Design a protein around this ligand. Structure first.
Ligand SMILES: *[C@@H]1O[C@H](CO)[C@@H](O[C@@H]2O[C@H](CO[C@H]3O[C@H](CO)[C@@H](O)[C@H](O)[C@@H]3O)[C@@H](O[C@H]3O[C@H](CO)[C@@H](O)[C@H](O)[C@@H]3O)[C@H](O[C@@H]3O[C@H](CS(=O)(=O)O)[C@@H](O)[C@H](O)[C@H]3O)[C@H]2NC(C)=O)[C@H](O)[C@H]1NC(C)=O
Ligand SMILES: *[C@@H]1O[C@H](CO)[C@@H](O[C@@H]2O[C@H](CO[C@H]3O[C@H](CO)[C@@H](O)[C@H](O)[C@@H]3O)[C@@H](O[C@H]3O[C@H](CO)[C@@H](O)[C@H](O)[C@@H]3O)[C@H](O[C@@H]3O[C@H](CS(=O)(=O)O)[C@@H](O)[C@H](O)[C@H]3O)[C@H]2NC(C)=O)[C@H](O)[C@H]1NC(C)=O
Ligand SMILES: *[C@@H]1O[C@H](CO)[C@@H](O[C@@H]2O[C@H](CO[C@H]3O[C@H](CO)[C@@H](O)[C@H](O)[C@@H]3O)[C@@H](O[C@H]3O[C@H](CO)[C@@H](O)[C@H](O)[C@@H]3O)[C@H](O[C@@H]3O[C@H](CS(=O)(=O)O)[C@@H](O)[C@H](O)[C@H]3O)[C@H]2NC(C)=O)[C@H](O)[C@H]1NC(C)=O
Ligand SMILES: *[C@@H]1O[C@H](CO)[C@@H](O[C@@H]2O[C@H](CO[C@H]3O[C@H](CO)[C@@H](O)[C@H](O)[C@@H]3O)[C@@H](O[C@H]3O[C@H](CO)[C@@H](O)[C@H](O)[C@@H]3O)[C@H](O[C@@H]3O[C@H](CS(=O)(=O)O)[C@@H](O)[C@H](O)[C@H]3O)[C@H]2NC(C)=O)[C@H](O)[C@H]1NC(C)=O
Ligand SMILES: *[C@@H]1O[C@H](CO)[C@@H](O[C@@H]2O[C@H](CO[C@H]3O[C@H](CO)[C@@H](O)[C@H](O)[C@@H]3O)[C@@H](O[C@H]3O[C@H](CO)[C@@H](O)[C@H](O)[C@@H]3O)[C@H](O[C@@H]3O[C@H](CS(=O)(=O)O)[C@@H](O)[C@H](O)[C@H]3O)[C@H]2NC(C)=O)[C@H](O)[C@H]1NC(C)=O
Ligand SMILES: *[C@@H]1O[C@H](CO)[C@@H](O[C@@H]2O[C@H](CO[C@H]3O[C@H](CO)[C@@H](O)[C@H](O)[C@@H]3O)[C@@H](O[C@H]3O[C@H](CO)[C@@H](O)[C@H](O)[C@@H]3O)[C@H](O[C@@H]3O[C@H](CS(=O)(=O)O)[C@@H](O)[C@H](O)[C@H]3O)[C@H]2NC(C)=O)[C@H](O)[C@H]1NC(C)=O
Ligand SMILES: *[C@@H]1O[C@H](CO)[C@@H](O[C@@H]2O[C@H](CO[C@H]3O[C@H](CO)[C@@H](O)[C@H](O)[C@@H]3O)[C@@H](O[C@H]3O[C@H](CO)[C@@H](O)[C@H](O)[C@@H]3O)[C@H](O[C@@H]3O[C@H](CS(=O)(=O)O)[C@@H](O)[C@H](O)[C@H]3O)[C@H]2NC(C)=O)[C@H](O)[C@H]1NC(C)=O
Ligand SMILES: *[C@@H]1O[C@H](CO)[C@@H](O[C@@H]2O[C@H](CO[C@H]3O[C@H](CO)[C@@H](O)[C@H](O)[C@@H]3O)[C@@H](O)[C@H](O)[C@H]2NC(C)=O)[C@H](O)[C@H]1NC(C)=O
Ligand SMILES: *[C@@H]1O[C@H](CO)[C@@H](O[C@@H]2O[C@H](CO[C@H]3O[C@H](CO)[C@@H](O)[C@H](O)[C@@H]3O)[C@@H](O)[C@H](O)[C@H]2NC(C)=O)[C@H](O)[C@H]1NC(C)=O
Ligand SMILES: *[C@@H]1O[C@H](CO)[C@@H](O[C@@H]2O[C@H](CO[C@H]3O[C@H](CO)[C@@H](O)[C@H](O)[C@@H]3O)[C@@H](O)[C@H](O)[C@H]2NC(C)=O)[C@H](O)[C@H]1NC(C)=O
Ligand SMILES: *[C@@H]1O[C@H](CO)[C@@H](O[C@@H]2O[C@H](CO[C@H]3O[C@H](CO)[C@@H](O)[C@H](O)[C@@H]3O)[C@@H](O)[C@H](O)[C@H]2NC(C)=O)[C@H](O)[C@H]1NC(C)=O
Lengths: 141, 70, 141, 141, 141, 70, 141
């Protein structure tokens, strides 16, 4: 008798644990699937903010940005002409569903830039999502 | 009627501060309860997913995904 | 009489041992299921730390890292351009739920690197989880 | 009794094998990087190399090859104008960090090639890291 | 009395068979590696090979094949342009560590192929290690 | 504490010449050991990656990827 | 005595059920291929279909459709250039194995479109498989 009752328990338990894992897999879908992103529109600009012979050079990155997602997002880094820059001061944030010009200040992480007036540099902006967007910036002066 | 005995979040043990919530026979419903870390200090990040396992008075444990909203 | 009493004991014992194993299987789920990981954001950089004609070359790997899990984690190895490197000095550690730039020093395990200024190398960072993440590092100089 | 004891063994073994496969998937990643170690720079040259009255047609091929990996790599095959060619003698190799004009001898496998002085032929070179690369070869005579 | 004595035998046998199956699962793993031993390099060539007035249409096929396994491997079948082909005579083989132009004779199984001079045909070659590989073949006439 | 007992690389068996190394409980380590082919010869290539399987004293084995350095 | 007989029956039944599950898995493979039964080919046209200043704008969607499936399959819905539309008339249906032109009347679900002569618009047509096919319609009206 014993063998068949044990076999039946492990069938019923097998069904329970298997269905629990299938329901778990359906529960992941809202977290992993998430349409919409920050989009970068047109060219941006770089402007020299540095003043008074200060020890650190500071630049100004103005660009037009459209958040197509359902949540507020922020910038976290920029890379320009292959060189990393830190975003000095509070990083700006783009509300859900909104198009804005945004401006923020940056400093080189190491070395110095060699920008030229009217030249165009490729840049990559990284958002709080981990998602990044390639952009073109024109150096104004 | 069956009640929540314990919860573990992302491997970490947690204590249900408030009284155990209970689900009546045959019902489907939302269930809400207050919980506190058993040790240390967690740091949930907005919009990230964590796996709870909730243990009910059957001894049955169910894995579930929670998204942090705070 | 004997046969039926023994048959009944082995039914009841069968139920007990089978339910004990089902409860054990539900007890594994918190250990094996563990969402969230270390995520590597944007490009990192390599910088030459070597000095004074020393016998060992030392490099600097700076990268931005986001721990989405509920526990503190550390780096344990890096492989760059197919070559293994040791993390000289205490390996850095990323607290739960936190985004950080991290920096650590490394030395080749065998041979020598042949990095070139401004070139980009694929790398893999391995964390204490056993989980690893592919990354791109730009050699600065 | 037997059924539950077997279920417990297969549960624990299942966890061990599943974790091993996940770790293996992360362990592959470094090996993918090496597939791009080589590139071919500019046009190369074909030259008829065989001695007077000799049975074998043999050609000298010269190309500039750049190696960016951490190990020496060698030529393994060439396809010229669609024809597969055999490589004669020892294969050449490119040291790990270097860019060099490389020269080697080849002989046709599929039949008789009819190169014309000053004509330009496409080729694909194949290397010991499993990479293939497009090339242009000018037949000098 | 009988019932308990039988239960003891089936408990011990259960442990022995369960452990044997777990060890078998680990014992499979080496055999999986060999499935990727071969790759086909560049275009190959088809050539009409049959003698004047002969009943059989027969073609010569030439391709470069690289073997990276620890054993010799042979060609077992080819499918050209969707048609299955039969292989005539002895199959060719590629020595364990080598890259070679390989030549073999084939004859159509499914009907009459109508190759056109200079046209390019996709093929799948199949090898004695159970692997299949995509190939391109240019019909020379 | 556990030890290695065999390795298979690219489908070929190898013997672990000299004392097999051993890993203490709860510990992470780089380990190094020497091996010889049991039959035939390998045909490794610099920078190429080979699948391998390491077998421990448990009978448990683990798949691995090895890069041939030179 | 009984325990051994029960063990034997469950061993034999185990073999049968395991084989049945393996055969069932292959039985799904033909069924899932029905998801690809329809192809939309060539380019379609869209033309004014309303008259006499009637209250509804109505149009004509002519397309060529090939059905590779074993059953007659029908148009469930259409979306034109991102906009939802309703098929006024009864759903058209494509018989098994046929290639044919298909023509049907359609109306905007909301607002007012303004197709311009000779411009191209992308329809996606959804068939009773749940399969959706993108197609280009040129406006003729
Ligand atoms: C953005 O604005 C920044 C601040 O004005 C500029 O950085 C400053 O550049 C000065 C020289 O300018 C020229 O040369 C650069 C290459 O070195 C080039 O990128 C520029 O486009 C421009 O052609 C520099 O002056 C230093 O160097 C001069 C020689 O080049 C020398 O004459 C100066 O005496 C001085 O050493 C600034 O450096 C700082 O100068 C301070 C004195 S003063 O120059 O203000 O009178 C001194 O006290 C301080 O120690 C020294 O560091 C330099 N400023 C900084 C912070 O580095 C930058 O060029 C502008 N453009 C871009 C694209 O970044
Ligand atoms: C990172 O920094 C490291 C330390 O400065 C660099 O390693 C050092 O490289 C020196 C040569 O530099 C050039 O050649 C390299 C290839 O060999 C190349 O990777 C570099 O990009 C660069 O073009 C080397 O100097 C040795 O070799 C010279 C010939 O190449 C020769 O002129 C020197 O006399 C010397 O032999 C360094 O080696 C060490 O040199 C000591 C004397 S001194 O050079 O400091 O004056 C000597 O006492 C010592 O025994 C010898 O080993 C070499 N240092 C080390 C520790 O290996 C490295 O190139 C930099 N870049 C990268 C990408 O790693
Ligand atoms: C590479 O160089 C080799 C010599 O180093 C060449 O071999 C020589 O080929 C000559 C003809 O080449 C033509 O025909 C080939 C097939 O035979 C063909 O593959 C080539 O692409 C090309 O179209 C050959 O000349 C013989 O044949 C001629 C007719 O084809 C005839 O006019 C000649 O008189 C001669 O019989 C060479 O043979 C040698 O010729 C010597 C005299 S001379 O031709 O140098 O004036 C003669 O003394 C000698 O006995 C005879 O064998 C043959 N060998 C040599 C040493 O020249 C090979 O074709 C080259 N391949 C390419 C692709 O350029
Ligand atoms: C095809 O490739 C072959 C190698 O794969 C080449 O063989 C090499 O030929 C070099 C001289 O070739 C010159 O003269 C030919 C007439 O004899 C002419 O057809 C060629 O076009 C070319 O103008 C030879 O170099 C010798 O002369 C050099 C001075 O010019 C001197 O520096 C060298 O030391 C040598 O004496 C090559 O030399 C051999 O060199 C070996 C070292 S290495 O050159 O490979 O680095 C050395 O170990 C050996 O002892 C020596 O004999 C010679 N190389 C080989 C491997 O044989 C052939 O010329 C190429 N053909 C064409 C038409 O270009
Ligand atoms: C591979 O090579 C074989 C010869 O080595 C070819 O066999 C020859 O095929 C000729 C026609 O080929 C065409 O028709 C085939 C079906 O018959 C078809 O499979 C081919 O793809 C191609 O479309 C055939 O020519 C005969 O038929 C012609 C009409 O189709 C007619 O115009 C000819 O006069 C002739 O009757 C060959 O037969 C031989 O022709 C000799 C004269 S000549 O044609 O060489 O000028 C004649 O003397 C002889 O009696 C007669 O049998 C036939 N055999 C030979 C030796 O040429 C085969 O088709 C090739 N396959 C491919 C794919 O290219
Ligand atoms: C299709 O494949 C067949 C093999 O599967 C080929 O048969 C081989 O033909 C070689 C010569 O072919 C040349 O001449 C043909 C006209 O007769 C022409 O149609 C071809 O396009 C090609 O130009 C033959 O090689 C001989 O000649 C060589 C010099 O060119 C010499 O080096 C060889 O030793 C040989 O004398 C092949 O030779 C046979 O070779 C055997 C060794 S191996 O070559 O297989 O390594 C040897 O054991 C045997 O005794 C000898 O007779 C010959 N191979 C076979 C197996 O028959 C056929 O040409 C291919 N057809 C085409 C159109 O390419
Ligand atoms: C497809 O054909 C349809 C019917 O022929 C067109 O829809 C009808 O368009 C009439 C005017 O057409 C002009 O304006 C359109 C935008 O409204 C434009 O797309 C056309 O290209 C063209 O430039 C419209 O008539 C109304 O508006 C006129 C002014 O534009 C005015 O003169 C009329 O008196 C009328 O107010 C139709 O609306 C219908 O008109 C009926 C009277 S009559 O026009 O037949 O004399 C009226 O009884 C009815 O209530 C009113 O709805 C309009 N029909 C509909 C259903 O909207 C359509 O533009 C064509 N093209 C496309 C791309 O859809
Ligand atoms: C980077 O961000 C800092 C805040 O995160 C910001 O600090 C603020 O500074 C302003 C005034 O700064 C001026 O003076 C300093 C010298 O003290 C210069 O380096 C600077 O360029 C400006 O000219 C101050 O009003 C405010 O209270 C500060 N805020 C905080 C939170 O401390 C830095 O100024 C900024 N760096 C640059 C170069 O702008
Ligand atoms: C943790 O669990 C307790 C029981 O499960 C619960 O006690 C109940 O408390 C409410 C009123 O609590 C208020 O006042 C206390 C101070 O006494 C605060 O700490 C608390 O935040 C509230 O502001 C009471 O009406 C009820 O009868 C209690 N229930 C029982 C069974 O005793 C605690 O409230 C709960 N902790 C929190 C923060 O809610
Ligand atoms: C690798 O990590 C070591 C610690 O794990 C570290 O030791 C520390 O060294 C610093 C000073 O090191 C300098 O001098 C040595 C020669 O003695 C050079 O090799 C080195 O590059 C530095 O220039 C010392 O202050 C500190 O107390 C040491 N800490 C410990 C725990 O011993 C090594 O320096 C480091 N290697 C490199 C190359 O940085
Ligand atoms: C395989 O393992 C052996 C021990 O299990 C080891 O023996 C030791 O050998 C070393 C010195 O070996 C050198 O010389 C021999 C020739 O005699 C070479 O084959 C070898 O490659 C080395 O170059 C010796 O100091 C030590 O005492 C030996 N230990 C014992 C216990 O005998 C073998 O050397 C080793 N095989 C290889 C190839 O390393």
């Amino acid at each position: 008798l014993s063998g068949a009752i044990v076999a039946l328990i492990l069938v019923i338990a097998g069904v329970i644990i298997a269905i629990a894992v299938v329901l778990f897999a359906f529960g992941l879908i809202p977290g992993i699937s998430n349409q919409g992103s920050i989009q970068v529109l047109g060219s941006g600009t770089i402007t020299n903010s540095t003043a008074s012979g200060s020890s650190r050079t500071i630049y100004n990155i103005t660009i037009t940005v459209k958040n197509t997602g359902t949540t507020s997002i922020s910038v976290t880094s920029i890379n320009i002409n292959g060189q990393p820059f830190n975003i000095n001061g509070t990083a700006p944030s783009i509300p859900a569903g909104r198009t804005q010009p945004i401006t923020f200040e940056v400093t080189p992480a190491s070395g110095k830039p060699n920008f030229s007036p009217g030249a165009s540099y490729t840049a990559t902006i990284y958002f709080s999502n981990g998602q990044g967007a390639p952009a073109t910036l024109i150096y104004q002066g």
